[PDB]
Amino acid sequence: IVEGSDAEIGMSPWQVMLFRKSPQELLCGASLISDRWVLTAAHCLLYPPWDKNFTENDLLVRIGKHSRTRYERNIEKISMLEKIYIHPRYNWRENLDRDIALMKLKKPVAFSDYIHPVCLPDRETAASLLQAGYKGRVTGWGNLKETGQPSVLQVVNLPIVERPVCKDSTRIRITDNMFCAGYKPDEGKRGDACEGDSGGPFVMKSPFNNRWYQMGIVSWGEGCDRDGKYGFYTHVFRLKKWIQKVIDQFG
Amino acid sequence: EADCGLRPLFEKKSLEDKTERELLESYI
Ligand SMILES: O=C1CCSCc2ccc(cc2)CSCC2CN(C2)C(=O)[C@H]2CCCN(C2)C(=O)[C@@H](CNC(=O)c2ccc(Cl)s2)N1
Numbered sequence: 717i718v719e720g721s722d723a724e725i726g727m728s729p730w731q732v733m734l735f736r737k738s739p740q741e742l743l744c745g746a747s748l749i750s751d752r753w754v755l756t757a758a759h760c761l762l763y764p765p766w767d768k769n770f771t772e773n774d775l776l777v778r779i780g781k782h783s784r785t786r787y788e789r790n791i792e793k794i795s796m797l798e799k800i801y802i803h804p805r806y807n808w809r810e811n812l813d814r815d816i817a818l819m820k821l822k823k824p825v826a827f828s829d830y831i832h833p834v835c836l837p838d839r840e841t842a843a844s845l846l847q848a849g850y851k852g853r854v855t856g857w858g859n860l861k862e863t864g865q866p867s868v869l870q871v872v873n874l875p876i877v878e879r880p881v882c883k884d885s886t887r888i889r890i891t892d893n894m895f896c897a898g899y900k901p902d903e904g905k906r907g908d909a910c911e912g913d914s915g916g917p918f919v920m921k922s923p924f925n926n927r928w929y930q931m932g933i934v935s936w937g938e939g940c941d942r943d944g945k946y947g948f949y950t951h952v953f954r955l956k957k958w959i960q961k962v963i964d965q966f967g
Numbered sequence: 968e969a970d971c972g973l974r975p976l977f978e979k980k981s982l983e984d985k986t987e988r989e990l991l992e993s994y995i
Binding site: 721724725726727729730749750828829832833834835847851852853871873875898920921922923926927928929949 | 968971972973974975976977978984985986987989990991993994
């Protein structure tokens with residue numbers, strides 16, 4: 717996270733860490749959506765040009781964490797993966813369309829003060845909250861700058877941008893399955909996600925019911941926190957039908 | 968999922984976090 721701040725303990729209890737087992741390495745972020753289901757970005761798991769085509773056996777997840785490096789006895793829980801699921805229509809050659817993946821844990825994770833799922837949105841919430849100018853929150857152990865890594869989980873709040881401004885910020889074919897957030901150059905304030913934040917959540921809190929909803933998945937930016945550039949997030953609601961298909965099948 | 972998105976150390980204890988009002992204030 718660029719220009720963010722340390723999370724308070726417990727501020728983001730759906731925050732998940734995705735590790736490669738061997739060599740043990742932090743790949744991406746991700747979010748707890750049930751007691752067996754974790755949501756990340758596809759490109760976190762599948763990107764051939766960067767030698768990334770993982771199976772369940774390759775990875776594990778850590779949940780309940782605050783510090784990037786230091787282990788946390790009785791807080792942190794490590795989980796094995798039963799099965800990875802990547803959207804069938806995920807595009808990686810071009811534009812990162814449908815950058816969405818689901819992971820099933822091999823065991824239910826126990827909830828605590830540090831571990832707790834986030835809500836997926838519905839039509840009402842998506843219509844209410846996905847408006848330009850409205851701010852959401854992005855978290856992660858990604859870099860603090862474009863060119864070290866943070867000691868503790870970072871958090872930053874960012875305004876959703878109007879589609880035309882998104883469209884014009886990049887020459888990447890942008891799709892209706894992503895939105896962009898971040899400040900315009902004239903707005904003075906800064907901040908963005910960066911390398912390592914991928915797959916983590918973009919959450920908003922509902923004024924109707926006081927709950928946290930995951931509106932986006934951190935997907936891509938050209939650099940971090942550049943003027944006239946914006947962050948791109950997978951639109952969770954537009955893909956919710958797939959999320960339900962997988963979870964409802966469990967397989 | 969009945970209880971998703973309510974944070975044990977925040978919403979469950981009726982404590983506001985450090986920056987969530989920023990989200991709030993961005994709805995007006
Ligand atoms: O973008 C990223 C995340 C993507 S990585 C793997 C990847 C690269 C390319 C493609 C698909 C996957 C097909 S092309 C579609 C698109 C625009 N594109 C990603 C690019 O320009 C990337 C080019 C490589 C250098 N970077 C940006 C990064 O190294 C880094 C930089 N940005 C970030 O990590 C983020 C900044 C704000 C958010 Cl949100 S995420 N990661």
